[PDB]
């Protein structure tokens, strides 16, 4: 098939009689034989450019400081919070008493109950740190 003659960085338009044409600026083709140059990803707002796009590779983003990546290729950004907090639709909210979060992301989780395994409390828990159990 003639379109296989077009390497990455070019495209084989099935219109205009399948000629290899170079990818216009701000577009790319990461593989040969493509029928169109894909639009280069743009990192705006919560997203930040990690690598600019070339004729043969898409641009890559990470998250602006204060946000963290989720999904393959950092396809999503989620807002950070501080330790002792969790993210809600209304913003960062402090952990409930008896729960904690030791990360800048994720949800709070309850303190370990030492008694349930015949253990005692060596260090009381905080909103940032779990209870420490001893024998």
């Amino acid at each position, epitope marked *: 098939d003639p379109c296989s003659n077009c390497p990455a960085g070019t495209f084989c338009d099935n219109n205009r009689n399948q000629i290899c044409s170079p990818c216009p600026p701000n577009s790319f083709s990461s593989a040969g034989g493509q029928r169109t140059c894909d639009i280069c*990803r743009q990192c705006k707002g919560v*997203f930040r450019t990690r690598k600019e796009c070339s004729s043969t590779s898409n641009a890559e*983003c990470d998250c602006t400081p204060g946000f963290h990546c*989720l*999904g*393959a*290729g950092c*396809s*999503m950004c*989620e807002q950070d919070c501080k330790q002792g907090q*969790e993210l*809600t*639709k209304k913003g960062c909210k402090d952990c409930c008493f008896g729960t904690f979060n030791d*990360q800048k992301r*994720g*949800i709070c*989780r*309850p303190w*370990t109950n030492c008694s349930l395994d015949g253990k005692s409390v060596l260090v009381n828990g905080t909103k940032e740190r*779990d209870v420490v159990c001893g024998p």
Partner: antibody, heavy 116, light 106 residues
């Protein structure tokens, strides 16, 4: 790349116990929740529960509380879902996923067929 | 409980609207997953309206009151799939999937 790889298909009889697994790779396994999701044939997704593998804290949805056990071995970046006694109605696809409300990675699924 | 219509059908190019209703679901973040036959679910909308990069821009979402809505403008045959809404509730730390909607395209 980040990957969640689940164990292969299982064929069991009612009354047998079973544990299936989900191995995460390419990221810090101890610091992301692992959720387990059931999908009976032709039915919808059902959240069963989740585990924080760093300290193995687990919680379950009310309809699966006491019916299954979720566990983890963080030294091998593996999460587990286990039954003490399977029923024929447990026949389903079971997915592991990373997260607690946003599931940004999914395993390929494990088919469990329970037939007398 | 999150309730979805079991079926939505459209012709190619028509707008597909998939609802997910729950009491005060507008107070939560709603996320939308797409699942094709034989495949694992894929997140197409997160935090009610945000689309992951790589998802076709014809996918959009909204959430207010007791209803969250996934909208596909100019629906294509490749969009035929099962669609599931999901929310997380901090009161009990539970995730809940809607019952699912099978989108068929003529």
């Amino acid at each position: 790349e980040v990957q969640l790889v689940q164990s292969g298909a299982e064929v069991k009889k009612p009354g047998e116990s079973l544990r299936i697994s989900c191995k995460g790779s390419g990221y810090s396994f101890s610091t992301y929740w692992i959720s387990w999701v059931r999908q009976m044939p032709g039915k919808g997704l059902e959240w069963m529960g989740k585990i924080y593998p760093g300290d193995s804290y687990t919680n379950y949805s009310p309809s699966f509380q006491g019916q299954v056990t979720i566990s983890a071995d963080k030294s091998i970046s593996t999460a587990y879902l286990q039954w003490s006694s399977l029923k024929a109605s447990d026949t389903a696809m079971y997915y592991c996923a990373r997260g607690y409300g946003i599931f940004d990675y999914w395993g390929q699924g494990t088919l469990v067929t329970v037939s007398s | 409980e999150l309730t979805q219509p079991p079926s939505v059908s459209v012709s190619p190019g028509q707008t597909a609207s998939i609802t997910c209703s729950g009491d005060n679901i507008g107070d939560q973040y709603a996320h939308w997953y797409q699942q094709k036959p034989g495949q694992s679910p894929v997140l197409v909308i997160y935090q009610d309206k945000n689309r992951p990069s790589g998802i076709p821009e014809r996918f959009s979402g909204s959430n207010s009151g007791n209803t969250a809505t996934l909208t596909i403008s100019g629906t294509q045959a490749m969009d035929e799939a099962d669609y599931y809404c999901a929310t997380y509730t901090g009161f009990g730390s539970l995730a809940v999937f809607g019952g699912g909607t099978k989108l068929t395209v003529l």
